[PDB]
């Protein structure tokens, strides 16, 4: 890899600089290089990895949605405009799939298999579910069902560990439940499951807030508010 000659610590330092400069493609390349050193990642490093790729794929998803909407309008009384909209939507889609495959490849080689603590293992399995979910958003072929089931399976394994090993207010556990609820609503055509999961997650977190410091309370309630916002949109 092009980062093979750079020290691990320098890659992490430069990822932090890239974040400050809003250079998320660079940030992701630095963090990929750091993962490829073969050592496990600390909590801060795991979050740097996620921030970088979430920003990269987030821009791709936003662009894909714009282009997909234009394409769908073109396929209604609509003047034929040639293959260009489809071609360019396909170009962005292929790039997005490539980023998702890269993240999934890092998780499979070898972040998940070396992650034994709940905070690392749940984090990575959640990420696996997320990037399969992003693949599912653009999937249409003989693979859509299998991609959806791969997302579901990763989220389910993460959920099972999180419920056994983490308190209901743990921010990773909350973010996982939030994203699995989004999977149910937006991917799996299961709005009732989404609503039930969001409600139970919110209520069980509410009942555990009394155990938390001021700073942890702030962290947990911020994520709980997203559960509440979705419940307001969904009901």
């Amino acid at each position: 890899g092009a980062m093979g000659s750079m020290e691990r610590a320098s890659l992490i330092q430069k990822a932090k600089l890239a974040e400050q400069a809003e250079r998320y493609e660079d940030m992701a390349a630095f963090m990929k290089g750091a993962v490829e050193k073969g050592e496990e990642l600390s909590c801060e490093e795991r979050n740097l990895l996620s921030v970088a790729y979430k920003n990269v794929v987030g821009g791709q998803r936003a662009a894909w949605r714009v282009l997909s909407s234009i394409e769908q309008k073109s396929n209604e009384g609509s003047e034929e405009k040639g293959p260009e909209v489809r071609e360019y939507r396909e170009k962005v889609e292929t790039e997005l799939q490539g980023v998702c495959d890269t993240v999934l490849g890092l998780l499979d080689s070898h972040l998940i298999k070396e992650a034994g603590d709940a905070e690392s293992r749940v984090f990575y399995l959640k990420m696996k579910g997320d990037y399969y979910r992003y693949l599912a958003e653009v999937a249409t072929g003989d693979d859509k069902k299998r991609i959806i089931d791969s997302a579901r399976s990763a989220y389910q394994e993460a959920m099972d560990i999180s419920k056994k090993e983490m308190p209901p207010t743990n921010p990773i556990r909350l973010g996982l439940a939030l994203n699995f609820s989004v999977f149910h609503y937006e991917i799996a055509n299961s709005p009732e499951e989404a609503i039930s999961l969001a409600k139970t997650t919110f209520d069980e977190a509410m009942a555990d807030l009394h155990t938390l410091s001021e700073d942890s309370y702030k962290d947990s309630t911020l994520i709980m508010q997203l559960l509440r916002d979705n419940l307001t949109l969904w009901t």
């Binding site: 979050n47 973010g175 979705n230 949109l233």
Partner: peptide, 9 residues
């Protein structure tokens, strides 16, 4: 309107 997923810190 699309559902809200987990946000960065």
């Amino acid at each position: 309107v699309r559902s809200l997923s987990e946000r960065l810190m």
